[PDB]
Subunit: 159 residues, 3 copies
C-alpha cells in the first residue's frame, strides 16, 4: 500500500527540417521537433513522471547529454532504462496517463501505436497506459504550431 | 487496491457573444468560452482526467468536436456520460482536484457552486472534489485574458 | 488506510529586478527574482496548492489573506508548514510530493537537493518521499524569454 505519484512535463520547438517523433511513432509532417536525439516530448514527460514517483530526480540527472553511455540512445531506450531503475529502487508501475498538446497534425490515428510502444517499454498491460491528444485552440506558441508539449502522470507502488 | 491516476488539461478562447460556463456555472460576463460544445473548460479537463485514469482515451475520442450531436452540448451531461463509462469499465472514482487559470472575471464567488456541480455529476460527496482558481500573474495569453485554462487530476480504483 | 487522494498544483511568478531569487527555500544567485508576497517562492506555492487540493481544502487564495495578522509577514516556508498543518487537521497524512520547475535560467541542478531537503523538513517527510525536477522551456514563450518561472506539483495523501 506504499503508493507514490509522479508528474512530468516536456516541450520542444517545432520547425521544418527534422522528423516528427512522438511516443516512438514517426509522423509525416512539414515540421519536426528540435532537440537532442529524437526529441520525443511524450516519452520524456513519461520518463520524468516515473523518476518523480520514485523520488529519483529527473531525466537530466540520469541521462546527461554529455554521458557517453547514452550518446546514441533514443528516447525509448531512455524510457526502458528509467523503468529498470524504478524497478531496482523497489517500485512497480501501476499506470501512466498523458496528454500531447499540438495544434497540428492530427495525432488520433497514432495513439494506439504510441500506447503499444510505451506499454512494451514499461512491461505494462496495455490497459494501464493512456495517451490523450488535443490542440491549444490556436492560443500561444503551441496554438501557432511553434512547439509541442507533453504532460504525464504516473502511479507506482513500493513492493 | 487497483488504483489508477489520470490527468487532464484544457483551454478555450474567450470571445464576445458566448455564455461563460465554467464548472457548470453560468457566470455573468461580457465574454464566454468558444467551442463546439458549451466550451466548459473545467469540466473538459476533469473529463479527460477521468478517461485517462481508466485508460479509455480522451474527450475527443468519446465526444467528437466534429459531430453535430455535440454542438452546444451541456458539458455536465458529457461529464456524467464519461463517469458512466468509467464505471462500466469497472472503476470507482475516489477524488478529483482541479485548477482554473483566468485573468478575469473573479471566480472565487462561483467555486463552491462548481464543486457541488462536479460532485453531483460524479456521485461524490463534496469532500472528494476540489476546485482551485488563480490568475496567471499577468503572463502570456492567459495574462492578456485571451482564453481560460483548466487542469485536473483524478484518482480511481478498479473494483 | 486505503483512502488515498491526489492533488495537483500550478504556479507562475514574474522575474523582476531588485529581488532575490528564492525557489524551494534556496536563494539562488541571479540578476532578477520572483515578484510576489514575501519571497514569492513559486515551487512552494505549487506544492501548497497540490496539498490543499489533495485534502479537498480549496486553495491558497482561500486560506491565506493579505489581511490576516498571522500571515502578513510569513514567508513561503511558513505558509507551506501551515498548509501541512491544515492537511493534518483535516485528517490526512502526506505520502509523497513530486514537482517540476520550469526556468530558462539560471541553472537549477546544483540547488535541487537543498530544495528537496527544505520541503521534506517543512512537510515532516523523509527525503525519499519528496522530489523536485528542473527543466527549461526550450526558449518558447514567456518562460523561454525569461519573463517568469513556473512550478508544477503533484501530491498523494491518505485519510488516516
Ligand atoms: C505572486 S505571489 O508570489 O504573491 N503568489 C500568489 C499571490 C496571490 C495568489 C496566489 C495563489 C496561488 C499561488 N500564488 C499566489
Ligand atoms: Zn525533451
Ligand atoms: Zn474543451
Ligand atoms: Zn504564487
Amino acid at each position: 500500500m506504499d503508493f507514490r505519484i509522479g508528474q512530468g512535463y516536456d516541450v520542444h520547438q517545432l520547425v521544418p527540417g527534422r522528423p516528427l517523433i512522438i511516443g516512438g511513432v514517426t509522423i509525416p509532417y512539414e515540421r519536426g521537433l528540435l532537440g537532442h536525439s529524437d526529441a520525443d516530448v511524450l516519452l520524456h514527460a513519461i520518463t520524468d513522471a516515473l523518476f518523480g514517483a520514485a523520488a529519483l530526480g529527473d531525466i537530466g540527472r540520469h541521462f546527461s547529454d554529455t554521458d557517453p553511455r547514452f550518446k546514441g540512445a533514443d528516447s525509448r531506450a531512455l524510457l526502458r532504462e528509467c523503468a529498470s531503475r524504478v524497478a531496482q529502487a523497489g517500485f512497480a508501475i501501476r499506470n501512466v496517463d498523458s496528454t500531447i498538446i499540438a495544434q497540428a497534425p492530427k495525432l488520433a490515428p497514432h495513439i494506439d501505436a504510441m500506447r503499444a510502444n510505451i506499454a512494451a517499454d514499461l512491461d505494462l498491460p496495455l490497459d494501464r497506459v493512456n495517451v490523450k491528444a488535443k490542440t491549444n485552440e490556436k492560443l500561444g506558441y503551441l496554438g501557432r504550431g511553434e512547439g509541442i508539449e507533453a504532460q504525464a502522470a504516473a502511479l507506482v507502488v513500493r513492493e
